[model samples]
Target: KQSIERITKILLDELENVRENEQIRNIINSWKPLPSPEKSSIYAVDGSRSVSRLSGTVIYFLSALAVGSGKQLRLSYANAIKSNYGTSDQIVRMQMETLENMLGYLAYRKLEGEKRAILMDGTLTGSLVRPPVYPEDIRSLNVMRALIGESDFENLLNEFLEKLRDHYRKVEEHLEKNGNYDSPILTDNVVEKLRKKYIDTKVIAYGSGKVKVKIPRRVIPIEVLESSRGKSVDELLQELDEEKVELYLGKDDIYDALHMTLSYIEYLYSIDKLLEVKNLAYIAKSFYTKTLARTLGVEIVDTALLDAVIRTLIGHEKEGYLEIEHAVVPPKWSFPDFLLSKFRNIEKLIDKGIHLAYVRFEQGDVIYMLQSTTNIEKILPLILHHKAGGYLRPLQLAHHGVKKEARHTLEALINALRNRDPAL
Candidate 1:
C-alpha cells in the first residue's frame, strides 16, 4: 500500500511538470480575439503523449481561442496516468477520464462563456473510455477501486455536460431578457455553421441498435491548412508566392517533410519501403489545398478535385523535369548541383522527350521562368537568366540580395559523396 501511494505521488508530480511547460504556456497565451465578435472565438484542444521518463499515457489538451481578428490566445492542461497492468482497454478509460476532467476545468474557467462557440476535434459526447459502464463481477480489490474511480469520472463528465447545458441556457435567457448581454449566446444557425466549419460528420457517429448515421467531413480551416501544407517543399514555395521559400525552409522540418513525402510516394508506387502512403497523401493534399485557398483569399473549391490534383502531382518527375530541362542545360545556365541532384530522376525523364512548360512571373518584365528549376534555385539569377540582356542584369544587380545557404542539410551528404563514404 505504501509503495502504491509513493508511486502515485511521483506520477502525479511528473504529470504536473508535463502540464506546465513554457511551450504549453506560450501556446495558451497566444490565443487572441477573433476579427468579428459575430464569429465565435474558436478554441482547439488536443492531447499528446508525455514528455517525462515514464511509460504512462500523458494526455495534454490545448485550447486556442481567437478573441479578435488576427489576435488569439491558448490555454492548455495535461494529465498523466499509469496504464493498468494487464489491459489496454483500462488505459484508454483512464485517459478519457483525464480528458473529461480537463474539459470540466475549461468550463469552470469560463472558457466556453468567453468564446462565442466551442469546437472540439472529435465528438463532444464520445470518450476514449469505452462500455460507458461495465459489469461488477470481475476484478481484484485494487482493480475494482480503479474501476469505481472511472465510474465516478463518468458521473463527473455527465455533470460537466449538464453544466454546459445550463450555461448555454443562461446565456440564451440573458440575451432574450436583457437584449444586450455582454456576451450573447450563439444562435442555432450559427452553432450549426461553426460545427460544419470545424467538426466533421464522420467524427460524430450516431446510432441506436441497428440505425446509424455517419456525417460527411468538412474542410479544415486555413490556419490549420497552412501549418500542415508548410510541410511540403514544393507546396510551401508555391503558396508563399515563391517569395519566402527560404524563410519556411528550416533544415530539420524540410528534411522531415521530404522524407514523409517520399515515403508516401513510394507507398503509392506499391513499393514496400513504406506502408499506406494513401493516407499521408490525403493529409498532404488537404493541407496544400487549404493553404492555397487561404493564400489566395478564397474558400476551398471542390475538395475532391483538389485531392486528385495533389495525387497527380506527387512524384511528378516527368512533368517537373520537362519544366526545368532548358534551365538545367548549360551555356544559357549553370544550375546548382544540389538542385540537380534532388531532381536528377526527373531530369532524366525530361531528357527523354518531355515538352517543357513556362510559368509566368507575378511581377517584373520576365514573362515566366520554368516552374521546376525556378523554385529550387535563388530567384534573382533564374529571373536574370529568363530575361538575359534585357536590362534584367541591372534589375538583378539592384536586387543584389546575398543568397542564403540552401536550407537542406546536404553538406554532410555532399562530403560523403566526395569521400566515397559508405554512410552515404
Candidate 2:
C-alpha cells in the first residue's frame, strides 16, 4: 500500500509538472465543443493479412475491403514461396498495407454524396524510425511500366546498369590493391551473368567513419568449379564471367531489387489522389510522436503532456482537438533514388507538408490522431457521430468485412488442397 501511495504521488507530481506548460495551457484555452454532424453516408477501408506454412513452403494471404454506397470492393491475393528463401512476416504486412491504401483510394472514387467522408484505419505518417522501404523489399512490379511510363522504366534500367558497371570497377580495384590476385579481375559484365551466380556488395563503416566496400564471392555450383583444376579456379571463373555465362539476370533479379522503389512511387501517387477526395480522413488509434513537444520548443512524450493538459482542466468535460504539427516527409526518413534526384534537397521537400490533429471525443481518456489534407473541422463531427467506443463505426464495419472474408478464403483454400492430396 505504501509503494502504491508513493508511486501515485510521484505520478501526480509528474502530471502537475506538464500541466503548467505554456503550450499545454494554450491548448486548454483553445478547446472547442464537438460539433454534431449532419446526415451522410460514411465509407471506410481496412485490410487483413495471414501467413501459413505447410512442409517446405510458406503461403501469404492478404485482403483489403471497403464498405460504402451499398457497394463493397474487395482485393485479395495469395502467394507461395519455398521456405528456404529469406522471408519476413513484415513483407506481407507491408503488402497488405499497400493494398489497403489502394482500396481506400478506390473507395473514394465509388463514394458520392454532398456530406460524404471516407475513413481509413491507419495514419498518413508512417513509422519514421523504421528503415525506409527499398526496391529489394517487395516481390513484384508487373504493373510498374504502365504506371510510371515506358521511357521512365527504360531509364531506370539504364541507371541500374550504370551503377553495376561502377560497382564491378570497385570490386576489381579492391582485389588488386589487397594483393588478393588469386582471383583475376573479372572483365565480364556482372549484370549479364547473374543467373545462379550474383554479385553481393556490402558497405562497412569503421569507428573512424571510413567506409569500406566489399564484394563477396558469387554463388555457383561447387562441382563445376572443382572439375576445371589445371585452369586455376580463378581463371575458370574469369572465363565463365567473360564468355560462358549466358545473359540471364533481368526478369526477377532486377525486378526484386527495384520492386519497393517503384511501389513507393506508386504509394505517393495514391496519396496525391486521396488528398483531393471530398472529405477523406485517416484515423490512427495511436501514435509515437513528439511533434507537440517540438511545437512547444520542448522535448517529451506527446500524449502524456497532452493528457496532463486534459486532466488539469478544472471544468465541465468538453470534447475537442489540437492540431499536431508534422513535416511532409519525416526526420531521418530516406527517399527513393528517383525522388532524391528530383528533390535534391530533402529537407526543403520535408518543409513543404500536411495537417495532423489529436481529437478526444466525449471528453474520453484517450485521444485519437486524425490525418487529413482538407479541413479536419468537417471530418471531426462526422467521426464523432459514428464513434464506436473509441473508433469510428464505418472503420469497424470495414475491418470485420475484410477479416471474416479473408478467413473464409484461407479455409476454402486449405480444404481444396486437402481434397487434392490426402496422406496418413
In TM-score terms, which candidate is top? 2
Candidate 1, residues 258-363, lDDT tens digits: the string is 2222222221121111111111000011222233234222322222332223223332211111122222222112122222333333334334321212222222
Tell me the whole-model lDDT of each prediction, alpha carbons only.
0.27, 0.53
- Quick one: how many clashes does candidate 1 have? 21
In model 2, the worst 10-residue window by lDDT is 179-188
RMSD of 1: 29.9
Predicted structure 2, TM vs. truth: 0.58
- Residues 6-105, model 2: lDDT tens digits: 8998877767766666565665656666677666667788888777765575677777777755366666667654453443444455556756655665
Name the Cα RMSD for model 2: 15.1
Which residue segments of model 2 deviate by more than 4 Å? 1-22, 36-40, 53-58, 81-87, 127-255, 262-269, 289-301, 312-317, 325-333, 340-352, 382-390, 404-424
RMSD of each: 29.9, 15.1
